[PDB]
């Protein structure tokens, strides 16, 4: 399973299990 998350500060990283 693949699920993406983004922040208003300036960061990009994938959430995987």
Swiss-Prot record:
UniProt membrane topology term: Peripheral membrane protein
PTM (free text): Phosphorylated ubiquitin specifically binds and activates parkin (PRKN), triggering mitophagy. Phosphorylation does not affect E1-mediated E2 charging of ubiquitin but affects discharging of E2 enzymes to form polyubiquitin chains. It also affects deubiquitination by deubiquitinase enzymes such as USP30. Mono-ADP-ribosylated at the C-terminus by PARP9, a component of the PPAR9-DTX3L complex. ADP-ribosylation requires processing by E1 and E2 enzymes and prevents ubiquitin conjugation to substrates such as histones.
Spans traversing the lipid bilayer: none
Section of the entire sequence shown: 1 to 17 of 305
Protein's name according to its UniProt entry: Ubiquitin
Compartment(s) of residence: Cytoplasm; Nucleus; Mitochondrion outer membrane
Main function: Exists either covalently attached to another protein, or free (unanchored). When covalently bound, it is conjugated to target proteins via an isopeptide bond either as a monomer (monoubiquitin), a polymer linked via different Lys residues of the ubiquitin (polyubiquitin chains) or a linear polymer linked via the initiator Met of the ubiquitin (linear polyubiquitin chains).
Position of the Glycyl lysine isopeptide (Lys-Gly) (interchain with G-Cter in ubiquitin) cross-link: 6, 11
């Amino acid at each position: 399973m693949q699920i993406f998350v983004k922040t208003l500060d300036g960061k990009t990283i994938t959430l995987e299990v």
